[PDB]
């Protein structure tokens, strides 16, 4: 009487919103980018090979100054690096050795990392003492934490395996807003440059964008047939790019409210561990788990280059804020740093 | 190279030394995975051997550090965190023998024993554990002997001979889990019947882990 009455109205709305997307889809992005020149072969060499890890690297985030970078590893060690001079800035002994994620604060003060322990421990780097201590042990999630991005020194958005994202307060140590929209385990996060919105893809093959002010699911994107593992924003904050296990990266647009491009090649059938953008956004760096990274072209869906220096599968790759170098971290315990050569 | 830069390298060398030493200690300790239903006697083994999220238990038996990860508390999909556990020595896999007639709580169409075998089929035939051996424990040996006389094993299996004694039925249950293993040359199942004695359960783990380590060593050496 009511269960099937609402199940038919839900499928009607879903049908009603796909007709709107089709109607506003007169052209694709494959047609507005034919007249522009191609990117060419982006041959980026391995400038540095950050080593010292003895186990698999799960995540790495850059800094605001585009020099320091934080690495999360399986051995229970969170290492802050110096990309230029290749010397360890810090190496935090972690309480859990199954750290799935780590971010670096935009001010450089704190570093967060959570994993299978389901707590995103926020470490205070710039402290009065020598050692790096635990500011707060954020707890309240039921599943594994897959991302811990920073809005600022006081607010951290975290994605978890209990199908919920949560906007944490660092001072009080409690959730201020809990984003409960997915039916599958959430794997990614990506903060917008204006820090108001954030999209996060889950294992239900859907990427939802949540506002941090109101706290509800602004939009919902579909199209993938497998689990979305990594999303990053185009540097406007108007488009994100997903990475699934079907070897397809899609370029969903927020104002058009649908997919623009499909970054997929025939020879690759493997998963997409990490996605990233350049400063301009022309190059879409996607980290495939067939041991190498493909330098996709965002506007043309052309494989401009291949970062093929890693023996085991690349897990997290990030590009600096100035866009200088892309550092890719694989499971062979090497954070190679890649940069173009003139 | 400035004095600030040289001292920063000197700090990194000190970080390198401690990080290498910690990795040496991490290599010495033996990681082993723990999968169970949660009510199937997994808890019983953890409390005996010691005397939300992951639970880590450290115990030393004979000149060796054992690290155990109790990952049954997470209700998420296994596919997106089982790849962390690729480098591991063994997988302790607790299955109660009393679960053959008891129905599963969530759906009750499938028995608890069949659900555990589905869990076993996923972990054994996983692409990440093509070389990692599995240690299987049959937890509720004491309860199973009393229950089998009252209720036969025929309710769980359409195809079964019908012996209805402990000696031959338990061996058949052991056979069923071993048959689910598709790859027999790379990984071997080590079945054990869990008893109340604390020393016996830990002794089997020490024996099996030592056996698995020798197989890894011999494969690397090349005698295999």
């Amino acid at each position, epitope marked *: 009487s009511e269960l099937d009455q609402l199940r038919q109205e839900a499928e009607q709305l879903k049908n009603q919103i796909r007709d709107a997307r089709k109607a506003c889809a007169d052209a694709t992005l494959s047609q507005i980018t034919n007249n522009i020149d191609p990117v060419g072969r982006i041959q980026m060499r391995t400038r540095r090979t950050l080593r010292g890890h003895l186990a698999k690297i799960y995540a790495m985030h850059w800094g605001t100054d585009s020099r*320091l970078l934080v690495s999360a590893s399986q051995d229970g060690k969170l290492i802050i690096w110096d990309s230029y001079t290749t010397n360890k800035v810090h190496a935090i002994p972690l309480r859990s050795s199954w750290v799935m994620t780590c971010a670096y604060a935009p001010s450089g003060n704190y570093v967060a990392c959570g994993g299978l322990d389901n707590i995103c421990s926020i470490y205070n780097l710039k402290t009065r003492e*020598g050692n790096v201590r635990v500011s707060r042990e954020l707890a309240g999630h039921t599943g594994y934490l897959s991302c811990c991005r920073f809005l600022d020194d006081n607010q951290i958005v975290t994605s978890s395996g209990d199908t919920t994202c949560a906007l944490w307060d660092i001072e009080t140590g409690q959730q201020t807003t809990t984003f409960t929209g997915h039916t599958g385990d959430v794997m990614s996060l990506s903060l917008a440059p204006d820090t108001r919105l954030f999209v996060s893809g889950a294992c239900d093959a859907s990427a939802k964008l949540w506002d941090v002010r109101e706290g509800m699911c602004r939009q919902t994107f579909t199209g993938h047939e497998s689990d979305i593992n990594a999303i990053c924003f185009f540097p406007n904050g108007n488009a994100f790019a997903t990475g699934s296990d079907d070897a397809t990266c899609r370029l969903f647009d927020l104002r058009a409210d649908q997919e623009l491009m499909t970054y997929s090649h025939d020879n690759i059938i493997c998963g997409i561990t990490s996605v990233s953008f350049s400063k301009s956004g022309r190059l879409l760096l996607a980290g495939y788990d067939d041991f190498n990274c493909n330098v996709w072209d965002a506007l043309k869906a052309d494989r401009a280059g291949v970062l093929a220096g890693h023996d085991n599968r690349v897990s997290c790759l990030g590009v600096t804020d100035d866009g200088m170098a892309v550092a890719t971290g694989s499971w062979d315990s090497f954070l190679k740093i890649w940069n173009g050569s003139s | 190279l400035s004095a600030e830069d040289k001292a920063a390298v000197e700090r990194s060398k000190m970080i390198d030394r401690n990080l290498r030493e910690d990795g040496e200690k991490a290599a010495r300790e033996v990681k082993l995975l723990l999968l169970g239903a949660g009510e199937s006697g997994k808890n019983t083994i953890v409390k005996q051997m010691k005397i939300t999220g992951i639970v880590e238990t450290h115990f030393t038996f004979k000149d060796l550090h054992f690290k155990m990860f109790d990952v049954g508390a997470q209700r998420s999909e296994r596919k997106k965190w089982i790849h962390c556990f690729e480098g591991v020595t063994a997988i302790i896999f607790c299955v109660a023998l009393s679960d053959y007639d008891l129905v599963l709580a969530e759906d009750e169409e499938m028995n608890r024993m069949h659900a555990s075998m589905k869990l076993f089929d996923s972990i054994c035939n996983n692409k990440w554990f093509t070389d990692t051996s599995i240690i299987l424990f049959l937890n509720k040996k004491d309860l199973f002997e009393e229950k089998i006389k009252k209720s036969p094993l025929t309710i769980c299996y359409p195809e079964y001979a019908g012996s209805n004694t402990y000696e031959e039925a338990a061996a058949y249950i052991q056979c069923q889990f071993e048959d689910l293993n598709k790859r027999k040359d790379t990984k071997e199942i080590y079945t054990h019947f869990t008893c109340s004695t604390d020393t016996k359960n830990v002794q089997f783990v020490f024996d099996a882990v030592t056996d698995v380590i020798i197989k890894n060593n011999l494969k690397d050496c090349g005698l295999f």
Partner: single-chain antibody
Amino acid sequence: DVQLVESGGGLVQPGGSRKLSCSASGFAFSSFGMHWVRQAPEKGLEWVAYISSGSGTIYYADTVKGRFTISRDDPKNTLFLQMTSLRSEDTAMYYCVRSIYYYGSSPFDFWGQGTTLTVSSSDIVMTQATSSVPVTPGESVSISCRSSKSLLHSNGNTYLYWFLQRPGQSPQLLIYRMSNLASGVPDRFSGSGSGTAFTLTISRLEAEDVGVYYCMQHLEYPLTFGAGTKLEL
């Protein structure tokens, strides 16, 4: 918070052996690189010795080379300076200084209280233009410091450090690497300059800004303090 209190000295015949013990509490002593700096009565500071973290690289000054040995014990968190063959020149106040070294680090940030050892009876020459300037609180004062060698290194940052020493108090870091500010200093202090002739500009003086301003170079050892500008309210 953090506290360095060093004891030992005060009555030593010339040629004697006095061992200075610096007891460190409240911080991770093993991480920091310890410094001993000496200050003669009504004279500028001089750098004595540095030990890195882990006792890897130990630097001495030219005047104290071969006579003084610096040792640190990491579990007891104690810094030991053994002083042998003392001269008339060695009457000074020795400060136990802790320094950290990484990108964005603030070395020479915390300073010991100091102990007085009195006795009975080439490198970058850091000079400063004036020695004492009478100024009033509330106006902008510019203290200059001219280096003999260009402190700008190839990596990009110039290693000049500003230290404020109050009358009867220990020195403190307030500007490190000529542009950045230490932890606890207000934003009224601003360091500028380019290449060699570096300068420090205070926006507004207060009662807690009176003291002596030094300008240590840190491009290469030995570390050279300039003859400080005394300020009188």
